[PDB]
């Protein structure tokens, strides 16, 4: 049982050559005090004689003074032992992967605008800026600028919408005369290397490195980045044989490194510094820069709706040492082109790393040719379809040819909770309400501290610890969870059904109430025709049955709603839970069945023959209460904290106490 | 990481196939045995302590041996026997005549001191259990039972009173008393004994030859419960075959003539083909007991086993004998 | 990524039969065959039952 051993594994989890380890001074002396002892020159001198002792005592002080220099450098010297972050990037940058500066809040708009000139084609030139208030705050909009040129066909009726996508900040372009001996610094903070583009005289060069990088451009066009230890970015390009080497495709051969400069190739670069990570979820937009003859009659948010979405995107801290540290090793491991699934993990982690807290690369053995991806928008659970499309194509750049990237947000276990938390009034002068605003931070803290990381077993209580930890003037804290999944088809279970991975109490399997259109007719004075009647139902589990099974009981039905079949009967069992309706309609059918041990849950509404369309809503939320304390996750099913988008899943009651 | 073994029986098994494999004429091996090299190893070769040069295996080495080859002799399967090392109860000359180790195999009636019983051929017993007092091969253990429970060998202290007796299943001089117990195998009839047996190695009967008489071999008595069995050689686990051959001057007078320095080295050959005047003529395997190497096709048949000795000098009217034992 | 694969497994076994096999030792014998067809003459007597 557990782990038997033969002298197994190696050297803890990770190398500590540990001659380097800083020890306690006294011990350091204690070691060294021995050192001077046994020294052939004198075996006589007693060190515990306080006279020599303090003298030797001093040697250690310097020796300790000097050691942490010698030791820390090693931690520094070796990535993943590097304690300095600007260290970490260096080896990472060296490994062929860099962390980036905060990455502009980005979005798309379509806007319908009439040109006053009625020309066939207007362009939106790159660099028109728009304003967006951050969510719920109009005090200031966040400026953001047209990413690139875009033109639009004038539709007939003369009004036509262009569409374009938007990153946040201001276009900031600077020309520089290049010179042989000189650094090329941008001292700009809020810079992000991903929105950095430049022009040598004329044509654009790309840092090969995550811009294009496979095109006929022959690599003569190129340059690099680097991070000044200061925190500002300096430019770099390869000098001399800037292409691979020698003769290559040219018949004349000789040597070209470019950028002599003398004055040649005056370098003009163009970039956006940004306020980002603060701008996420900026919904209200403005058209903040006018053009000749173009007038936006409407700017309408979010083409191709998710439908659940927020304003902009992006931003970023930028920096985290933990996600960055090991990571580049995989990029150090992998080549540029992404090949391995985790190579697709780490590669995706490069670009939209600030978009994605966690990305799950996997194959679905069913569909080959598709790279199946489960990622965290980290602002939310759902990358807007353009993002999905966006990184996809960009990702798709690095990939095996027949392979296709396929990104889907996996299903998400939802933890539906009412919280009961007590505090002493007197104990806190601070505004009660804001306390709730406090805890509501510290709740996701645990998540971000834990749950999204591994998507392992989830501890309710352990979560409640930190929210307990919040005010310390909180007297007590309580909560109750309802494990919640969302369902895409009310009508038919997914083939495999649905499983909780987690034991639930019998009969504690619930669902959402929802109306149902019933063909029967309603008329009321002044109402007139009134279509027909519709009432609501919900999905009900019957009791546990022997062999841990249950049959899915449909919501209550009025008489004549469902054509009665000799096969299908009103379940009309004693047990099954029932909502209380004004109808008193007692017709209940089995639409399907479950078993509690397997946690697998199936039904089909084809069973009851009831028409899909006589239901109004396509998706229903799923309610259940796991009998077990902690929540287990397996695959693609992860508990997560999104309160803002889905507050009804998170509720907190506040108990004032004197 | 796995562990695996071959049973000692498979040694026996190889033999039985191999024994089956000597054919008469067709499509089964025929065996010739050859001697040659009048030529002197070196002037010393005669002297005491002389060891001929270690033989060489090669198409070259073959040729040379095939070159010098004086004479050739066939082998009939009836000259092939399974054998195990002979050990007799009570023989003074050799150590511990009276001290037997578990599973040792004991011959009885072989000799007057041996002989318990007149009017019966040799007997073959195996000794199941040995006296309790004794010595362990592992110096750490003073108990036979503990020595053996661990599996180290045990040497018993107490000698056997009498060589075992009775056809029955373990005898063993178990009831009245003794340290030894005895299991019976079969009895060897006298004629085969005298002619086959080398005082080091008794001859063990073939299963087929066993199929003929269970009685003449005394095996008829027992119990097999498989019906015929006869696989007895498995029980003794003989891994060793004895080739017997007979050289005579008469077939090869030329090498027999007075003054020959004799043949240095010996070689056996399997399935050679006759000489033919016309190479397109169909090949012929070799029936007759001896062939001048001439009467045999060059290089025909395969020689498995090559041999080199200090010179031995044959002489006419002398009769020389060869025995060879393969341990599979 | 993007591909599954199917896996059949196999094994081999590497075993020395032959090292055990050898020739132990070869012996021979010296005999005087009684064919009749002889006179005595050289010497006499000697071995006497």
Q: Which of A612, A609, A608 is CA-nearest to residue A620?
A: A612
- List subunits contacting chain A, requiring 3 or more Cβ pairs under 8 Å: C
SS3 content of chain B, % helix, strand, coil (to 5): 20, 25, 55
Which residues does B21 contact at the CB level (< 8 Å), separation at least 6?
B28, B29
Taking the C-alpha atoms of residue A282 and residue A274, their distance in angstroms, rounded to an integer, is 14
HSE at residue A278, side-chain half, CA atoms within 13 A, is 12
Q: CA–CA distance from B244 to each of A652, B86, B291, B296 (Å)? A: 103, 17, 18, 22
Taking the C-alpha atoms of residue A595 and residue A620, their distance in angstroms, rounded to an integer, is 21
Residue with tokens 């060059």: B298
Taking the C-alpha atoms of residue B300 and residue B279, their distance in angstroms, rounded to an integer, is 13
- Nearest by CB to C31, from B266, B319, B324: name it: B319
Which residues does A386 contact at the CB level (< 8 Å), separation at least 6?
A108, A165, A304
Q: Does C1 touch chain A (CB under 8 A)?
A: yes
Hey, which bits of B89-232 come out as E strands?
105-108, 122-127, 134-136, 154-156, 182-188, 201-204
Judge contact between A34 and A56, C-beta under 8 A: no
Phi and psi (nearest 5°) for A160? -150, 140
* β partners of residue A294: A115
Taking the C-alpha atoms of residue A491 and residue A534, their distance in angstroms, rounded to an integer, is 17
Judge contact between A380 and C14, C-beta under 8 A: no
Judge contact between A79 and A325, C-beta under 8 A: yes
Taking the C-alpha atoms of residue A316 and residue A105, their distance in angstroms, rounded to an integer, is 8
HSE at residue A484, side-chain half, CA atoms within 13 A, is 19
- Nearest by CB to C28, from B317, B320, B326: name it: B320
Judge contact between B36 and B69, C-beta under 8 A: yes
Taking the C-alpha atoms of residue B91 and residue B102, their distance in angstroms, rounded to an integer, is 18
Taking the C-alpha atoms of residue A493 and residue A603, their distance in angstroms, rounded to an integer, is 5
Q: CA–CA distance from A38 to each of A28, A35, A46, A53 (Å)? A: 17, 7, 11, 15
| Peptide bond just before A307 cis, omega within 30 deg | yes
Q: Which of A206, A203, A197, A218 is CA-nearest to residue A265?
A: A203
Q: Which of A409, A395, A314, A387 is CA-nearest to residue A348?
A: A395
Judge contact between B161 and B177, C-beta under 8 A: no
Which residues does A189 contact at the CB level (< 8 Å), separation at least 6?
A231, A232, A273
Taking the C-alpha atoms of residue A473 and residue A262, their distance in angstroms, rounded to an integer, is 69
Q: Does A337 touch chain C (CB under 8 A)?
A: no
A411: which DSSP letter?
P
Taking the C-alpha atoms of residue B309 and residue A349, their distance in angstroms, rounded to an integer, is 81
Q: How many residues does chain C have?
A: 49
Taking the C-alpha atoms of residue A450 and residue A125, their distance in angstroms, rounded to an integer, is 45
Which chain C residues have a beta carbon less than 8 Å from that of B327? 20-24
The H or E element containing residue A407 is: strand A404-407
Token pair recorded at residue A241: 């044989």
Pairing type for strands A653-657 and A412-424 reads parallel
Strand ordering across the sheet containing A129-134: A129-134, A137-146, A163-167, A106-115, A294-301
Cα A80-A85-A88 angle, rounded to 5 deg: 45
Torsion of CA A248, A250, A253, A255, to 10 degrees: -80
Q: What domains are defined for chain B?
A: 6-81+240-328 (2.60.340.10), 82-239 (2.170.290.10)
Taking the C-alpha atoms of residue A224 and residue A98, their distance in angstroms, rounded to an integer, is 11
Q: Chains A vs B: touching, with 3+ CB pairs under 8 Å?
A: no
Which chain C residues have a beta carbon less than 8 Å from that of A372? 2
Torsion of CA A105, A108, A114, A119, to 10 degrees: 100
Ramachandran category for residue A161: left, alpha or beta (phi over 0 → left; psi -120 to 50 → alpha):
beta
Judge contact between A544 and A575, C-beta under 8 A: no
For A365, nearest residue in chain C (alpha carbons):
C4
Q: Does C7 touch chain A (CB under 8 A)?
A: no
Structural resolution in Å = 6.8
CA-based end-to-end distance of chain C: 96
Taking the C-alpha atoms of residue B239 and residue B11, their distance in angstroms, rounded to an integer, is 5
SS3 B69: strand
Q: CA–CA distance from A422 to each of A430, A434, A461 (Å)? A: 15, 14, 16
B200: which DSSP letter?
T
Taking the C-alpha atoms of residue B163 and residue B120, their distance in angstroms, rounded to an integer, is 15
Count Cβ atoms below 10 Å from residue A60 Cβ, excluding itself: 20
SS3 B31: strand
Judge contact between B272 and B33, C-beta under 8 A: no
Q: How many residues does chain B have?
A: 328
Phi and psi (nearest 5°) for A344? -75, -30
- Per-position DSSP letters for A221-242, written without gaps between them: S--EEEE-TTSSEEEE---SS-
- Per-position DSSP letters for A453-490, written without gaps between them: HH---B-HHHHHHHHHHTTS-EEEEEEEEEEEEEES-S
Q: Which of A465, A477, A460, A466 is CA-nearest to residue A442?
A: A466
Q: Does C2 touch chain A (CB under 8 A)?
A: yes
Query: Distance from CA of residue A543 to its chain's centroid?
Result: 39
Judge contact between B65 and B303, C-beta under 8 A: yes
- Nearest by CB to C22, from B266, B322, B327: name it: B327
Which chain A residues have a beta carbon less than 8 Å from that of C4? 363, 365, 368
Cα A420-A426-A428 angle, rounded to 5 deg: 70
Q: What domains are defined for chain A?
A: 103-169+275-315 (no CATH), 170-274 (no CATH), 333-410 (3.30.300.200), 411-658 (no CATH)
How many CB pairs lie under 8 A apart between chains A and C?
Answer: 22
Count Cβ atoms below 10 Å from residue A231 Cβ, excluding itself: 12
Judge contact between B109 and B42, C-beta under 8 A: no
Q: Which of A384, A378, A340 is CA-nearest to residue A359?
A: A378
Q: Does C32 touch chain B (CB under 8 A)?
A: yes
Inter-chain contact A368–C2, Cβ cutoff 8 Å? yes
Count Cβ atoms below 10 Å from residue A142 Cβ, excluding itself: 24
Residue with tokens 């875009």: A150
- List subunits contacting chain C, requiring 3 or more Cβ pairs under 8 Å: A, B
Judge contact between A201 and A278, C-beta under 8 A: no
Judge contact between A166 and A109, C-beta under 8 A: yes
Taking the C-alpha atoms of residue A224 and residue A94, their distance in angstroms, rounded to an integer, is 12
Radius of gyration over every alpha carbon of chain C, rounded to an integer in angstroms: 34
Taking the C-alpha atoms of residue A166 and residue B43, their distance in angstroms, rounded to an integer, is 107
Q: What does the buried/exposed string (b/e) look like for B276-286 if buried means 16 or more CB atoms within 10 Å of the residue's CB?
A: eeeeeeeeebb
Taking the C-alpha atoms of residue A515 and residue A532, their distance in angstroms, rounded to an integer, is 13
Inter-chain contact C29–B320, Cβ cutoff 8 Å? yes
Inter-chain contact B266–C26, Cβ cutoff 8 Å? yes
Which residues does B64 contact at the CB level (< 8 Å), separation at least 6?
none
- Nearest by CB to C25, from B317, B319, B325: name it: B325
- Per-position DSSP letters for B238-261, written without gaps between them: --EEEEEEEEEGGG-HHHHSTT--
Residue with tokens 């661990």: B150
Judge contact between B4 and C15, C-beta under 8 A: yes
Which residues does C22 contact at the CB level (< 8 Å), separation at least 6?
B326, B327
Q: Does C21 touch chain B (CB under 8 A)?
A: yes
Which chain C residues have a beta carbon less than 8 Å from that of B322? 26-29
| Peptide bond just before A261 cis, omega within 30 deg | yes
**Three-state secondary structure readout of A638-650:** EEECCCCCCHHHE
Judge contact between B276 and B283, C-beta under 8 A: yes
A68 by Cβ neighbours in 10 Å (0-12 / 13-18 / 19+) ranks as exposed
Judge contact between A558 and A585, C-beta under 8 A: yes
């Amino acid at each position: 049982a557990n782990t038997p051993v033969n002298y197994q594994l190696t050297r803890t989890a990770n190398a500590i050559p540990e001659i380097f380890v800083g020890g306690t001074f006294a011990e350091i002396k204690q070691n060294l005090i021995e050192w001077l002892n046994g020294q052939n020159e004198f075996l006589d001198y007693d060190f515990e004689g306080s006279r020599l002792n303090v003298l030797c005592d001093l040697l250690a002080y310097n020796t300790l003074y000097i050691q942490q220099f010698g030791n820390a450098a090693v931690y520094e010297s070796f990535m993943r032992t590097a304690n300095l972050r600007s260290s970490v990037v260096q080896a990472a940058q060296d490994n062929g992967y860099l962390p980036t500066s905060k990455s502009a809040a980005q979005t798309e708009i379509m806007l319908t605008c009439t040109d006053a000139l009625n020309r066939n084609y207007i362009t939106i030139p790159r660099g028109t800026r728009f304003l967006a208030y951050a969510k719920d705050t109009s005090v200031n909009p966040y400026n953001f600028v047209s990413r690139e040129d875009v033109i639009a066909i004038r539709d007939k009726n003369n009004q036509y919408f262009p569409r374009l996508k938007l990153a946040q900040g201001r276009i900031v372009r600077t020309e520089i005369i290049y010179d042989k001996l000189t650094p090329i610094i941008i001292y700009d903070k809020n810079i992000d290397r991903n929105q950095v583009k430049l022009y040598v005289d004329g044509a654009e060069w790309i840092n090969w490195t995550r811009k294009s990088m496979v095109h006929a451009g022959s690599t003569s066009t190129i340059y690099y980045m680097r991070e000044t230890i200061d925190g500002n970015t300096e430019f770099y390009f390869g000098e001399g044989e800037i292409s691979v080497n020698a003769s290559e495709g040219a018949l004349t051969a000789n040597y070209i490194g470019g950028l002599k400069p003398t004055q040649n190739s005056t370098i003009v670069i163009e970039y956006i510094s940004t306020n980002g990570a603060d701008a996420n979820g900026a919904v209200g937009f403005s058209y903040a820069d006018t053009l000749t003859n173009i007038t936006v009659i409407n700017i309408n948010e979010n083409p191709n709706d998710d439908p659940d979405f927020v304003g902009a995107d992006g931003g970023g801290d930028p920096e985290d040492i933990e996600r960055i540290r090991e990571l580049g090793t995989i990029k150090r491991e992998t080549q540029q082109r992404c090949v391995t699934a985790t190579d697709y993990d780490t590669f995706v982690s490069e670009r939209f790393g600030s978009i994605i807290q966690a990305v799950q690369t996997f194959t679905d053995s069913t569909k080959p040719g598709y790279a199946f991806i489960a990622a965290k928008p980290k602002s939310g659970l759902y990358l807007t379809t353009v993002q999905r499309e966006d990184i996809k194509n960009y990702l798709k750049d690095y990939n095996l040819a027949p392979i296709t990237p396929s990104i889907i947000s996996p299903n998400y276990l939802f933890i539906k909770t009412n919280l009961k938390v007590t505090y002493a009034l007197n104990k806190l002068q601070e505004s009660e309400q804001w306390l709730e605003g406090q805890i509501i931070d510290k709740i996701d803290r645990y998540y971000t501290e834990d749950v999204e990381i591994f998507n392992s077993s989830f501890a309710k209580s352990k979560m409640l610890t930190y929210v307990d930890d919040a005010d310390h003037s909180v007297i007590g804290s309580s909560a109750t969870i309802q494990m919640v999944r969302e369902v895409q088809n009310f009508y038919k279970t997914p083939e495999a059904g649905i499983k909780y991975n987690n034991q639930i109490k019998d009969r504690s399997m619930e669902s959402n109430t929802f109306s149902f259109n019933s063909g029967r007719k309603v008329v009321n004075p002044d109402t007139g025709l009134e279509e027909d009647v519709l009432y609501d139902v919900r999905i009900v589990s019957t009791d546990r049955d022997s062999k841990g099974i249950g049959k899915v009981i449909i919501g209550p039905f009025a008489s004549g709603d469902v054509t009665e079949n000799e096969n299908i009967q009103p379940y009309t069992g004693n047990d099954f839970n029932k909502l209380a309706n004004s109808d008193g309609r007692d017709k209940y059918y089995v639409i399907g069945e479950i078993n509690y041990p397997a946690d697998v849950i199936y039904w089909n509404i084809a069973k009851i023959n009831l028409t899909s369309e006589k239901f109004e809503v396509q998706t229903i939320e799923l309610y259940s209460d796991p009998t077990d304390d902690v929540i287990f996750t397996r695959d693609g099913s992860l508990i997560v904290f999104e309160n803002d988008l889905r507050p009804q899943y998170l509720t907190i009651d506040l108990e004032p106490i004197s | 990481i796995y562990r695996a073994i071959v049973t000692s029986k498979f040694r026996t098994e190889k033999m039985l196939n191999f024994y089956n494999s000597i054919g008469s004429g067709p499509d089964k091996n025929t065996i010739f045995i050859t001697f040659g090299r009048s030529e002197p190893w070196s002037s010393n070769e005669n002297e005491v302590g002389f060891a001929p040069p270690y033989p060489t295996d090669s198409v070259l080495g073959v040729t040379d041996m095939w070159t010098h080859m004086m004479g050739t002799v066939k082998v009939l399967p009836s000259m092939l026997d399974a054998v195990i090392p002979r050990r007799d109860w009570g023989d003074t000359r050799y150590p511990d005549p009276y001290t037997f180790r578990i599973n040792d195999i004991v011959v009885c009636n072989s000799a007057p001191y041996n002989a318990t019983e007149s009017g019966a051929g040799w007997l073959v017993y195996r000794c199941l259990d040995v006296p309790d007092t004794g010595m362990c091969s592992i110096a750490s253990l003073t108990d036979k039972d503990e020595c053996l429970k661990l599996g180290g060998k045990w040497t018993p202290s107490a000698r056997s009173m009498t060589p075992p007796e009775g056809r029955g299943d373990a005898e063993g001089t178990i009831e009245p008393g003794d340290g030894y117990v005895w299991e019976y195998l079969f009895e060897i009839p006298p004629d085969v004994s005298i002619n086959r047996c080398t005082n080091e190695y008794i001859v063990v009967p073939w299963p087929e030859e066993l199929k003929e008489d269970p009685t003449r071999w005394g095996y008829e008595d027992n119990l097999t419960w498989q019906q015929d069995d006869f696989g007895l050689i498995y029980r003794v686990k003989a891994n060793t075959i004895r080739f017997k051959a007979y050289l005579d001057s008469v077939y090869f007078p030329e090498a027999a003539l007075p003054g020959n320095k004799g043949f240095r080295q010996i070689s056996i050959i399997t399935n050679p083909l006759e000489a033919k005047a016309h190479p397109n003529d169909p090949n012929v395997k070799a029936e007759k007991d001896y062939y001048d190497p001439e009467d045999l096709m060059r290089h025909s048949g395969e020689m498995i086993y090559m041999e080199n000795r200090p010179p031995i000098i044959m002489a006419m009217d002398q009769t020389e004998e060869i025995n060879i034992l393969f341990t599979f | 990524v993007g591909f599954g694969f199917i896996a059949i497994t196999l094994l081999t076994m590497f075993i020395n039969v032959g090292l055990t096999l050898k020739h132990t030792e070869t012996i021979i014998n010296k005999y005087k065959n009684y064919k009749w067809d002889s006179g005595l003459p050289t010497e006499y007597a000697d071995r006497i039952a």
